[PDB]
Structure formats: C-alpha cells, structure tokens
C-alpha cells in the first residue's frame, strides 16, 4: 500500500478502462482507482520528504487526490447507469488529474 504500488494501480486501471467493452470491468476498475487514490493521499511522496504534513505543498499533493476522487466518482456514476462510452470518455479527463499532480511533485 505504498504510494509507488497504488500509482501502479492508478496506471493499469486507467488502461482497463481504456480497453474494456462492457460496465462491469469499467466499474471494477474505477472503485479499485478510487480506493488506491485514497491509500495514495497518506503517503509522502519523495520529492517533498522534507516537508512538514501540514505545510501547502502536502496540503495540495492530498487535495490532488480529493479531485481524483470526484472525477472517479462521476465516472462511476456513468457506470453504474450502464453508460460505459460515457464512463471511458469521463476516465478520459481524469488524465488532467494525474499530469497536473505529476507536474508539481513526481
Ligand atoms: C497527486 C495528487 C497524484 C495524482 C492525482 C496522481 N499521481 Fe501518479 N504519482 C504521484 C507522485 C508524487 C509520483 C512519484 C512517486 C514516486 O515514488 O516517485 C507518482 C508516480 C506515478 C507513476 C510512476 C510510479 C513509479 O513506479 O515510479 C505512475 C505510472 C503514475 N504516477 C500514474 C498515475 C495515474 C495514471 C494517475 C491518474 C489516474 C496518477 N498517477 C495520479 C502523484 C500523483
Ligand atoms: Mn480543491
Ligand atoms: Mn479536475
């Protein structure tokens, strides 16, 4: 559950998003996301090890992870109504997410 292996997850299941066919496999996917995001957010990432827990920069890497969560959830949404072209589009956008945090701290 360390951040290196939930990012593993975060990559593979934006890519099974990307490929499946049906809704069941895009909802597997984004609720096994939305749980790595949220064991992600406890974490301290290397490039801000010597940062306090509540300095800004821990402050918004964790609230990165509170966007994630939202766009993960509306795509669940979407999947769970059965609208699987919806949901992929929706995964789509989540990529903003991960480049933006990435950007500033990976
Ligand atoms: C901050 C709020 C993050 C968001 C959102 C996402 N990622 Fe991330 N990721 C983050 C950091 C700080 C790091 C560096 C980790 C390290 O220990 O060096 C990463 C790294 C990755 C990696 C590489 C992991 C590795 O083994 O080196 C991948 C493949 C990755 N991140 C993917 C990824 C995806 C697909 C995301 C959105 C769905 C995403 N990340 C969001 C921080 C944050
Ligand atoms: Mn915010
Ligand atoms: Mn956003």
Known sequence: ????????????????????????QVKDALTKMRAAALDAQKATPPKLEDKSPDSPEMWDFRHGFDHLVGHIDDALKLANEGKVKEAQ?????????????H????
């Open 1 to 24: 559950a360390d951040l290196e292996d939930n990012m593993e997850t975060l990559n593979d299941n934006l890519k099974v998003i990307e490929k499946a066919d049906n809704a069941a």
């Open 89 to 101: 589009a929706a995964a789509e956008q989540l990529k903003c997410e991960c480049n933006a945090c």
């Open 103 to 106: 950007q500033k701290y990976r």
